[PDB]
Amino acid sequence: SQFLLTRLKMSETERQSMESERADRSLFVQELLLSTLVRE
Amino acid sequence: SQFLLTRLKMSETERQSMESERADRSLFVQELLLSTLVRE
Amino acid sequence: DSCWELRLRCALSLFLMAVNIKTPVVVENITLMCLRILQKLIKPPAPTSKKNKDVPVEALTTVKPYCNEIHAQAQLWLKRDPKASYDAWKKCLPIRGSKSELRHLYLTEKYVWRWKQFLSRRGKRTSPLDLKLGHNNWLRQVLFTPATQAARQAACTIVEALATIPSRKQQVLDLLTSYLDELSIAGECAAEYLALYQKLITSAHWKVYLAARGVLPYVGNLITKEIARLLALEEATLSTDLQQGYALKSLTGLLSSFVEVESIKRHFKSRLVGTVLNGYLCLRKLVVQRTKLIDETQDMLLEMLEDMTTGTESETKAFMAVCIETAKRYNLDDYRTPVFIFERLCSIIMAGVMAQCGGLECMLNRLAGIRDFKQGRHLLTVLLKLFSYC
Amino acid sequence: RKAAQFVDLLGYFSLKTPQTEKKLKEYSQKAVEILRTQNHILTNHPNSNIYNTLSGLVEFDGYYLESDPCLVCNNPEVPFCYIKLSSIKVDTRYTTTQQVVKLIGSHTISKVTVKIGDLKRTKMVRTINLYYNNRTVQAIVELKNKPARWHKAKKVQLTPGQTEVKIDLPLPIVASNLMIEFADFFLCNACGFCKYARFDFMLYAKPCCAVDPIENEEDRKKAVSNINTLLDKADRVYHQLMGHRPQLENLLCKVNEAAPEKPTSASVNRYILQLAQEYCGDCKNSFDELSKIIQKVFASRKELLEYDLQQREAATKSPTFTASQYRALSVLGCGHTSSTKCYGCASAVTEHCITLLRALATNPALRHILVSQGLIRELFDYNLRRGAAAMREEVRQLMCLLTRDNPEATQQMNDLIIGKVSTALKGHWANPDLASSLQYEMLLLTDSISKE
Amino acid sequence: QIAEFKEAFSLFDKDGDGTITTKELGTVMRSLGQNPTEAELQDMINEVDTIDFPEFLTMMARKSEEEIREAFRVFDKDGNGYISAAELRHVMTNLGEKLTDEEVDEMIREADIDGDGQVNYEEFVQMMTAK
Ligand SMILES: [Zn+2]
């Protein structure tokens, strides 16, 4: 616990932004996966 | 020991020929190995 | 991080390059990892922000996908196409937001869509794909793979998440229904897939929509084919299988689930009585290749038969007609199934309807075919009882 | 594994009979096709990864992770043994001149050796009668009834003063309760003490899986109920057995990493110990219980089906069949077929294919046809690294023999070896397993060179 | 053709009274091979409205130049008969779409054959009838 290097926070607005970005990334991956199942 | 397929001789002149051929094959391999140690 | 797209491209390339290999070592060591990566990306962790403590994931997106098109295109995306990137895709979607207002919105959306279609048709704008899912893919391969169960579970989670807006859910349900015939080939390995399917149709209107598309005859045909295979196997060999009757049990349970609600029970009873009656008789014929699952299937089939045989006079007449129809095909030497048919008829006694349908000659030939008394006492007793009834 | 003699004879006859080239081509095609099909089955088997990883770490006899138990692999050839009658005893009752015994279970008795000690001249036994039955009862006095419920086995007459007698049975008997009667000339009715002599019994028997016969309808009902109970127990045991697979795959995944652990039979890696305990300790016990229950179910089904056939024939008697049709219809041809998805049986078929191909390759024309089929690549890619050590050496010998005097085949084999070695050596630096997984290619090269 | 619509209506009929709920209205013609949109669905609810067979048949029978004229009137808010880039931008913003000035200008320009940089009623009619 005395090692200094082992010890080498986020606000709320950026938390909302991160959650929204996670949402759009999920939607994009969903549509990308749907695109590979289309009929040929 | 009752299996038939498990049981599926050489004369003297062909033995002499085989020993001679072994001798020349040995000599050829010797010279082939000596050829790779020459100066460059 | 900000380079997430390149990592996702690597993962997806590895997934699609190694998704069609049947070897268990590849499924366990390559496909499962890519499936877990995709599952983590599709289903993000629950939000912790104070405002968004209650709302789900679908309520957080800043754009709204179109109902009947797919704008993301994987074939160009995997080749590093600047016109098919993530920002390019997100730029093509609209931001999340009286009678005349509704009308104006309708025609504006419709004719703007037509304008864009013409612009893509003649100009240079990229044309979105159509939402029509193929019936042969990697999805059926992954959903029923016997190499490892975790791959099946991850695929089930992915396909469950792929069905959120009803436009996609309709196609997803259609594909899963098409996958129904894999139950017999992959008996216990389908345990996950079934658990997904029943969850996706847990609402009444989806069951009714599937019924309208002609799924009840499909399940009936599958059940009859499985019962016929069971009879053929019972006739020939004497092997023991610890999984016998799983697929038949699952299909019968699914049919009972489709029937429990009122509308399809009332509508589709006239077309399903013959199948259920024949299946019940054939299952009762089993004497050696009988297990607990077959017993439960027979019990449920009997309960279904009891439930459907309750209605007006026209349906009772139709049921009698189909009962005589199934009595016709049975040969004159067996003395078990006709006894059941005729005691059922006498219990439901109706007495003159078979005069109209012409079933009298059937029972006349049944009397004429009796050449022995020791082995035909029950048939004679029931036939005489119904003759006195008639 | 039952077809060793058949493939032996097939190879010998194919080697001795001179035949046209078309017949030789057809025969070689059939052999190679069977080999290819078995290799394909083996490489895609759901349990193939687990068995392949387990082979090099633990020592195990059978494959205990099979969904459908295989009658061929579950039924080894058990030999007879000499068992003392008292060791299998459960309950006994004596009368004045008879002795009734019940055993733990059924047994296939072949011979009975009876020993006499402390005999007295006052009275000895002149005739011994043996009786047996295979009906299980809980009370000996219940089965004491003489006439109806016993079957004759053997009557033996003794010369006066005999000390040991060998009651041989020409046909082995499947018995659960036994009776011995002294016909021509003693025993305590309560304890069975005999003052005239002392009798000891030996049996040439082995454990047998059999059930009570069916004679009437309530016996059929009891058989049906018992078979339902056995099926339920088998289902429970089968689920308990198949529940072990996720833990086995987790342990395999952890072992594959091969991370060093810091701490001589206890100094082996703990994950290897856990793998051995999980497979050879618990899966083996579950598999054995499942096989026992499956055998009991099979015997019960056979008895029930025989009774049904007899009853149907009796009802019909109030169609000639040829000799082969009788065997096809009857219960004789019922329990000699292997399961379709069986790892051990596919391995045995591959062994037979390798042996037959080794026999066939000794004909130069057949050798040329086989190498034209493309056998060398199939043997190189599949059978070099799979099987026991003896099988691997036999495959190496067959591959060497296939190129005995064919420059093209030798060039093909050398190309395969050189390509694999170069491909591995290119990435040897970043992965040493590539350099250490060339032992079979180099062994093949050594074997090919050592044969002039 | 009436038989399929009647069968679908009856199959979606819950209480057996010959009437369904409008919440399941989209599913009825979603099962018939047609694919509607949410705005289409609210419009269809508005036009008629619990629906009985006659109204359902009326809705199905309408599944005309009056529609094109109404769309042109909605596009031309000022009623001047000419569709400016500003009007199209306002319509797109109301619909929620996002577009650039260059893209909208190119769309308007590709919609003009006369070279006047404006959309006429005849031009829109010809664009709609293009096959
Ligand atoms: Zn086997």
Numbering used by the authors:
A (entry chain C), B (entry chain D): 289 to 296, 300 to 331
C (entry chain A): 3983 to 4079, 4088 to 4339, 4475 to 4515
D (entry chain B): 3463 to 3647, 3698 to 3775, 3788 to 3842, 3849 to 3982
E (entry chain E): 9 to 57, 63 to 76, 82 to 149
Authors' description from the paper:
Among the >600 human ubiquitin ligases, UBR4 plays a particularly important PQC role, being an essential and conserved E3/E4 ligase found across eukaryotes. Aside from teaming up with various ubiquitin ligases, UBR4 activity is linked to two specific cofactors: calcium-binding protein calmodulin (CALM1) and KCMF1 (13, 16, 17, 20, 21). Our data show that the evolutionarily conserved UBR4 complex forms a megadalton E4 arena, in which inward-facing ZZ-DZB domains of KCMF1 act not as E3 ligases but as substrate receptors. The architecture of the E4 megacomplex is conserved across eukaryotes, but species-specific adaptations allow UBR4 to perform its precisely tuned quality-control function in diverse cellular environments.
Cryo-electron microscopy analysis of UBR4 in complex with its cofactors KCMF1 and CALM1 reveals a massive 1.3 MDa ring structure, featuring a central substrate-binding arena and flexibly attached catalytic units. Two UBR4 molecules dimerize through two remote, structurally different interfaces to form a large ring-shaped assembly. The second, larger interface is formed by Armadillo repeats in the C-terminal portion of UBR4, with laterally aligned helices sealing this contact. CALM1 and KCMF1 bind at this C-terminal interface, as predicted for the trimeric sub-complex. The C-terminal helix of KCMF1 inserts like a pin into a hole in the UBR4 Armadillo repeat and is covered by a small lid insertion within this region, which also mediates CALM1 binding. This arrangement implies that the proper folding of the Armadillo repeat scaffold and its associated lid depends on KCMF1. Indeed, co-expressing UBR4 with a KCMF1 variant having a mutated pin helix (L318A/F319A/V320S) yields monomeric UBR4 protein.
